[PDB]
Design a protein around this ligand. Structure first.
Ligand SMILES: Cn1c(=O)n(CCCO)c(=O)c2c1nc(Oc1ccc(/N=N\c3ccccc3)c(OC(F)(F)F)c1)n2Cc1ccc(Cl)cc1
Lengths: 644, 35
């Protein structure tokens, strides 16, 4: 092929030396080149190079301020050099450029926005000192989406928050939230919107990390009853602000207010005597034995022991000792001591209702796992009370109808003991060993839910095929049982219900191979049914259960990177529920003028210390070694000039 | 909104040169300013 330049012109010959002179740093040469009296030297001072940089662009690139001033005093073209200087963060040139069609900056980029993007304290301070205003974020959808993102990217810089605000904590919390819900209604720049919210979460943590004494930390967390600001941070899902060693220690001090074997026995001893100290809270809420239950740790042990008492007699309601079979029986001994716990749980849920309203109250797992069990208990009570007054007689149990109310009440009561005993895992967020495991186990569980939508389609397809093949051969002649749940399995693929059940039990190998036969010498249809059953077995056991392992093994590594800041957040959420009255009775026995000034002073100290730390860290980091060379070279140059 | 400068003041108009003298490094000016 033959190559020629496409759409490019040549600049000049004389201007080459001028560009080289302004590049190298010949101050006198550039002055001479610009020195024209009554006639121009045909040298275009505002000429562009093949690289695309103007004469003022070359100078600001090399930091040489003297030639910059020389050029500015001769009135060269200006209007784009300020943005380039701000982008290069040359503070010396910014002041000079301030007290005075092809562009590489988007026409919506104001100098203040670019300065905030660069995140430089000095440049932003100099710009704001003269007075600038950042536009408020609310055809051409490409520019409008970019414009919105540039304003938010410049409004979230830590320097601007620390330099222009009234409470750097509140602005960090609110901005980080509205940047989180904006990443979903704008699901095309989601990666660059999550990260912008991420850096607003660490700013509050860093600002709180600058505390010096314990007194000021308490005042920060008690601004605006007790721990008012801490409750506000939990609302905005500030995980890093809560999982900080100082506030964790402060919370532990209130929570607790020994050895491995010296703590279990103490906990057992304390839990064994919960009713006495609980009754002391009602007879006389005093210091001798009524203020002990006021300790959050003590209260947590008693509630755990009381719930285990309810679970213990729940296991005593299935002992044959405690009653024959008879229609509509009065409740047994255990039921009358079970009823108070159910009533207390329902009362606690109803009390929790008044501060919710289905807004974040139903999204939590252990609220929709309590509603179901409470509904089941209420349904059990209703069915039992219905069966009691309209039935009697010690008729043998082998003669009752399958839809008798007593059987349904017993079944729904049984389905309710499985959910009551599965809420003990929610207490694992109090142990340093079992805590993180539960939190990480409940996070690799939305991945499994996404994998059910494929198995439920494969199962339905194969069930449809097998039923369509086998529904012509149904028979129930000379057989006591019918289905797969008896000793001689038969009629496995006769209907759609039995086909959906037969393909579920085949995962565990509980379906035999003789169910694919018929009472006829049709070997062709039997072979097709067996082949379809084998094909279903292959797909779901070696192709579909090995991709659930492979994608859970590659999703556990991300959860384990941040698993201590979530467990501590959950543990603090659990802790803060026991701090206040309104529940200091186990379920069995269930029925400003200067504060603003001080806060502002502490805020000033924190902001100043944070600014000092950030400038110290940014200035130093290899990069410090660059300044000394320039300093000594300048000192030598000045010494030589003074000697000459 | 209007971005402003909160809880800050100005340094000087003649001490800026004195500070820049030690920023760049020149014995003559630095000594003279102090003397
Ligand atoms: C789907 N099926 C099936 O339902 N019945 C039951 C019908 C009778 O009741 C089979 O008997 C069978 C089969 N498949 C087979 O042979 C394989 C096996 C596995 C393959 N692959 N992978 C895996 C992966 C993991 C676990 C197990 C297998 C495979 O791969 C292929 F060659 F590409 F097809 C081919 N046979 C055996 C057979 C019968 C007749 C002949 Cl002439 C040849 C072979």
């Amino acid at each position: 092929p033959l190559r020629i330049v496409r759409a490019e012109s040549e600049l000049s010959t004389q201007e080459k030396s001028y560009l080289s002179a302004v590049e190298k740093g010949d101050y006198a040469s550039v002055k001479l080149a610009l020195e024209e009296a009554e006639i121009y030297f045909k040298i275009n001072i505002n000429c562009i190079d093949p690289l695309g940089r103007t004469a003022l662009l070359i100078a600001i690139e090399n930091e040489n301020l003297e030639i910059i001033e020389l050029l500015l005093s001769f009135n060269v073209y200006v209007g784009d050099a300020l943005l380039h200087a701000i982008r290069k963060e040359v503070v010396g040139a910014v002041e000079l450029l301030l007290n005075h069609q092809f562009s590489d900056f988007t026409p919506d980029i104001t100098p203040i926005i670019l300065a905030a993007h660069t995140n430089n304290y000095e440049i932003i301070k100099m710009l704001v000192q003269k007075g600038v205003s950042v536009p408020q974020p609310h055809v051409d959808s490409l520019r409008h989406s970019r414009s919105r993102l540039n304003i938010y990217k410049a409004l979230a810089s830590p320097s601007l928050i620390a330099l222009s605000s009234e409470d750097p904590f509140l602005t960090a919390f609110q901005l980080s939230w509205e940047l989180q819900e904006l990443s979903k209604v704008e699901n095309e720049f989601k990666a660059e919107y999550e990260e912008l919210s991420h850096q607003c979460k660490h700013f509050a943590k860093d600002l709180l990390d600058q505390t010096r004494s314990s007194r000021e930390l308490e005042l920060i967390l008690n601004f605006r009853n007790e721990l008012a600001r801490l409750k506000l941070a939990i609302k905005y899902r500030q995980k890093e602000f809560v999982a900080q060693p100082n506030c964790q220690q402060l919370l532990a001090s209130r929570w607790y207010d020994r050895h491995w074997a010296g703590k279990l026995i103490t906990c057992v001893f304390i839990g064994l005597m919960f009713p006495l100290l609980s009754l002391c809270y009602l007879v006389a809420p005093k210091s001798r034995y009524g203020l002990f239950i006021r300790k959050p740790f003590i209260k947590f042990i008693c509630h755990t022991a009381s719930y285990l008492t309810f679970l213990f007699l729940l296991l005593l309601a299935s002992q044959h000792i405690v009653n024959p079979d008879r229609q509509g029986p009065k409740p047994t001994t255990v039921e009358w001591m079970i009823l108070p716990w159910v009533l207390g749980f329902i009362w606690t849920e109803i009390k929790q209702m008044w501060d919710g309203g289905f807004q974040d109250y139903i999204h939590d797992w252990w609220n929709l796992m309590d509603f179901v069990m409470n509904s089941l208990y209420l349904a059990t009570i209703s069915l039992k009370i219905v069966a009691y007054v309209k039935y009697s007689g010690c008729k043998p149990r082998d003669t009752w109808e399958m839809w008798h109310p007593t059987l349904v009440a017993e079944a729904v009561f049984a389905i309710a003991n499985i959910f009551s005993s599965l809420r003990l895992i929610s207490l694992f967020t109090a142990n340093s060993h079992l805590g993180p495991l539960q939190i990480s186990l409940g996070r690799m569980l939305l991945d499994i839910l996404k994998f059910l939508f494929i198995y439920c389609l494969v199962l339905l397809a194969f069930a449809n095929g097998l039923n369509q093949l086998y529904f012509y051969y149904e028979n129930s002649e000379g057989m006591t049982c019918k289905g797969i749940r008896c000793e001689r399995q038969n009629n496995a693929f006769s209907t759609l219900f039995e086909t959906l059940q037969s393909l579920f039990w085949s995962i565990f190998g509980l379906i035999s191979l003789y169910v694919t036969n018929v009472k006829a010498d049709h070997k062709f249809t039997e072979f097709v049914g067996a082949t379809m059953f084998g094909t279903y077995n292959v797909i779901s056991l070696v192709v579909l259960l090995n991709m659930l392992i492979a994608m859970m093994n590659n999703s556990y590594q991300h959860i384990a990177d941040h698993a201590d800041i979530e467990w501590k957040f959950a543990r603090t959420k659990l802790w803060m529920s026991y701090f206040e009255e309104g529940g200091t009775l186990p379920p069995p026995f269930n029925i400003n003028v200067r504060l603003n000034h001080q806060y502002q002073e502490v805020l000033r100290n924190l902001v100043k210390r944070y600014v000092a730390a950030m400038i110290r860290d940014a200035k130093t980091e290899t990069e410090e070694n660059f300044k000394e060379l320039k300093q000594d070279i300048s000192s030598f140059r000045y010494e030589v000039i003074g000697m000459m």
